[PDB]
C-alpha cells in the first residue's frame with residue numbers, strides 16, 4: 181500500500 | 186494524491 | 191487496485 | 196477520480 | 201458482507 | 206471500493 | 211467494521 | 216483507505 | 221501476484 | 226481485499 | 231509478503 | 236490492514 185501524496 | 190494499494 | 195484521485 | 200481495480 | 205466495488 | 210463487513 | 215478503500 | 220472499526 | 225478483492 | 230504477493 | 235487489507 | 240512480511 182503506498183501512497184504518494 | 187494517488188494511492189497504489 | 192490503484193486509485194488516482 | 197478514477198480507480199483501476 | 202457486502203462489497204460495493 | 207467500499208466494503209461493509 | 212466498514213472500510214472505505 | 217480509511218477504516219472505521 | 222494474486223489479489224482477492 | 227487481500228493480496229498475496 | 232501478503233497483506234490483508 | 237495487517238501485513239505479514
Ligand SMILES: O=C(O)[C@H]1O[C@@H](O)[C@H](O)[C@@H](O)[C@@H]1O
Pocket residue numbers: 184
Ligand atoms: O517521486 C519522488 O519524489 C519519490 O517517489 C517515491 O515513490 C520513490 O520511491 C522515490 O525514490 C522518489 O524520490
Ligand SMILES: O=C(O)[C@H]1O[C@@H](O)[C@H](O)[C@@H](O)[C@@H]1O
Pocket residue numbers: 187194
Ligand atoms: O500522474 C501522476 O502525477 C502520477 O500518476 C501515477 O500513476 C504514476 O505512477 C506517477 O509516476 C505519476 O507521477
Ligand SMILES: O=C(O)[C@H]1O[C@@H](O)[C@H](O)[C@@H](O)[C@@H]1O
Pocket residue numbers: 189192
Ligand atoms: O506499476 C503498475 O503495475 C501500474 O502502476 C500504476 O500507477 C500505473 O498507472 C500503471 O500504468 C502501472 O501498470
Ligand SMILES: O=C(O)[C@H]1O[C@@H](O)[C@H](O)[C@@H](O)[C@@H]1O
Pocket residue numbers: 199
Ligand atoms: O491499461 C489498461 O489496460 C487500460 O487502462 C484504462 O485506464 C484505460 O482507459 C484503457 O484504455 C486501458 O486499456
Ligand SMILES: O=C(O)[C@H]1O[C@@H](O)[C@H](O)[C@@H](O)[C@@H]1O
Pocket residue numbers: 204
Ligand atoms: O447505490 C447504488 O447505486 C446501489 O447500491 C446497492 O447496494 C443497492 O443494492 C442498489 O439498489 C443501489 O442502486
Ligand SMILES: O=C(O)[C@H]1O[C@@H](O)[C@H](O)[C@@H](O)[C@@H]1O
Pocket residue numbers: 207214
Ligand atoms: O461517500 C461515498 O461516496 C459513499 O460512501 C459509502 O460508505 C456509502 O455507503 C455510499 O452511499 C456513499 O455513496
Ligand SMILES: O=C(O)[C@H]1O[C@@H](O)[C@H](O)[C@@H](O)[C@@H]1O
Pocket residue numbers: 209212
Ligand atoms: O451503517 C453504518 O454503521 C455505517 O455505514 C457506512 O457506510 C456509513 O458511511 C456510516 O455513516 C454508517 O454509520
Ligand SMILES: O=C(O)[C@H]1O[C@@H](O)[C@H](O)[C@@H](O)[C@@H]1O
Pocket residue numbers: 219
Ligand atoms: O463517527 C465518528 O465518531 C468519527 O468518524 C470519522 O470518520 C469522522 O472523521 C469523525 O469526525 C467522527 O467523529
Ligand SMILES: O=C(O)[C@H]1O[C@@H](O)[C@H](O)[C@@H](O)[C@@H]1O
Pocket residue numbers: 224
Ligand atoms: O475462495 C473462493 O471463493 C475462490 O478463491 C479463488 O482464489 C479461487 O481461484 C476460487 O477457485 C475460489 O472459489
Ligand SMILES: O=C(O)[C@H]1O[C@@H](O)[C@H](O)[C@@H](O)[C@@H]1O
Pocket residue numbers: 227234
Ligand atoms: O480470513 C479470511 O477471511 C481470508 O483470509 C485470507 O488470507 C485467506 O486466503 C482466505 O481463505 C480467508 O477466507
Ligand SMILES: O=C(O)[C@H]1O[C@@H](O)[C@H](O)[C@@H](O)[C@@H]1O
Pocket residue numbers: 229232
Ligand atoms: O501461504 C502463506 O504463506 C500464507 O498465505 C495467507 O493467505 C494465509 O493466511 C497464511 O496462513 C499462510 O501462511
Ligand SMILES: O=C(O)[C@H]1O[C@@H](O)[C@H](O)[C@@H](O)[C@@H]1O
Pocket residue numbers: 239
Ligand atoms: O505466524 C506468526 O509468526 C504470527 O502471525 C501473526 O499474524 C499472529 O498474530 C501471531 O500470533 C503469529 O505468531
